[PDB]
């Protein structure tokens, strides 16, 4: 018996956790005894991309970090089995838990996301989808990167992966090089982290989301010209505003994520040092 091979007949669906465009995550109980005593697991499957899910499974199987969701196995068509984190995504958790989470805890979550991302970068991978909706809450003290659906390998001595299909792109979290040439560097993930940090600091408020704020900056009636207008505004040096009640020193670290050139752009190691200095 392979402990990473889950039989479909014992995988009992409890409820949906969330869904994207092509995939969904469900809470299941892996119950081989048939008495509802088995382990609860999160199960990722595609909506009725198969090649892309198989590649994602192999990436997650080889990632081992305290701030990266734990791979548990597969159910072979294929389903990805992972550990279940009851508090859900940061996007759902933060609006309901503002009383429990203060600035100090937000900065500790920030460090933890940087550590998981720095580990991913060390394994030569680029995430391409770093947003609060992809960060999971293990407890009020810990977060983990919880999805690798768009993750791609960066070639040795190369700075980037060349994206062919831009159709599932979160453009309001994307660096200018991603928008203009679909060039994905580890530096492009640092840009997206800065956007995720803005979300975390606003408690993932929908009205102050990166999409809502950029649309107010560029105008919301540009239709197919929207990304072009977003590129123009970023070239002008305009950036997302400072979250209410966010100290200028934290906003300054955020601004360093948004240096136009993917060179004036810092590393995750550099950001960790910044946040730790603010925590002491
Ligand atoms: C990262 O969250 C998601 C990832 C996705 N991919 N496709 C759909 C999709 C949906 C979610 C999602 N949207 N709202 C909550 C969640 N996820 C969880 O509650 C969850 C708990 N443990 N767990 C383990 C692995 C992945 N997800 C989880």
UniProtKB/Swiss-Prot annotation:
Compartment annotation: Endomembrane system
Record note on modification: Autophosphorylated. Phosphorylated by TYK2 on tyrosine residues in response to type-I interferon signaling, leading to its activation. Phosphorylated on tyrosine residues in response to interferon gamma signaling. Dephosphorylation of Tyr-160 and Tyr-161 by PTPN2 negatively regulates cytokine-mediated signaling.
Family (UniProt): Belongs to the protein kinase superfamily. Tyr protein kinase family. JAK subfamily.
Organism: Homo sapiens
Residues annotated as catalytic: 129 (proton acceptor)
UniProt disease annotation: Autoinflammation, immune dysregulation, and eosinophilia: An autosomal dominant disorder characterized by immune dysregulation, severe atopic dermatitis, and chronic gastrointestinal inflammation. Additional features include asthma, food or environmental allergies, as well as poor overall growth with short stature.
Signal peptide: none
Tissue occurrence: Expressed at higher levels in primary colon tumors than in normal colon tissue. The expression level in metastatic colon tumors is comparable to the expression level in normal colon tissue.
Physiological role: Tyrosine kinase of the non-receptor type, involved in the IFN-alpha/beta/gamma signal pathway. Kinase partner for the interleukin (IL)-2 receptor as well as interleukin (IL)-10 receptor. Kinase partner for the type I interferon receptor IFNAR2. In response to interferon-binding to IFNAR1-IFNAR2 heterodimer, phosphorylates and activates its binding partner IFNAR2, creating docking sites for STAT proteins. Directly phosphorylates STAT proteins but also activates STAT signaling through the transactivation of other JAK kinases associated with signaling receptors.
Gene behind this protein: JAK1
Modified residue annotations for Phosphotyrosine: 160-161
Protein name as it appears in the record: Tyrosine-protein kinase JAK1
């Amino acid at each position: 018996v392979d402990p990473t091979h889950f039989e479909k007949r014992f995988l009992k669906r409890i409820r949906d956790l969330g869904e994207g465009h092509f995939g969904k995550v469900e809470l299941c109980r892996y119950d081989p005894e048939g008495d509802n005593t088995g382990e609860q697991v999160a199960v990722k499957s595609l909506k009725p991309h198969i090649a892309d899910l198989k590649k994602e499974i192999e990436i997650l199987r080889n990632l081992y970090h305290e701030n990266i969701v734990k791979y548990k196995g597969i159910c072979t068509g294929i389903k990805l089995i992972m550990e279940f984190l009851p508090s859900g995504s940061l996007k759902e958790y933060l609006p309901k838990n503002k009383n429990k989470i203060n600035l100090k805890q937000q900065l500790k979550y920030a460090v933890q996301i940087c550590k998981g991302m720095d580990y991913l970068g060390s394994r030569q991978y680029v995430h391409r989808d770093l947003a609060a909706r992809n960060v999971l809450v293990e407890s009020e003290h810990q977060v983990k990167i919880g999805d690798f659906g768009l993750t791609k390998a960066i070639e040795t001595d190369k700075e980037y992966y060349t994206v062919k299909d831009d159709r599932d792109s979160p453009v309001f979290w994307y660096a200018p090089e991603c928008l203009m040439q679909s060039k994905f560097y580890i530096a492009s993930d640092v840009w997206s982290f800065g956007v995720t940090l803005h979300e975390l600091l606003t408690y993932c408020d929908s009205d102050s989301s990166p999409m809502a704020l950029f649309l107010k900056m560029i105008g919301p009636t540009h239709g197919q010209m929207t990304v072009t207008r977003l590129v123009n505004t970023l070239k002008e040096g305009k950036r997302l505003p400072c979250p209410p009640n966010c100290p200028d020193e934290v906003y300054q670290l955020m601004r360093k994520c948004w240096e136009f050139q993917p060179s004036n752009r810092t590393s995750f190691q550099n950001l960790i040092e910044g946040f730790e200095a603010l925590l002491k």
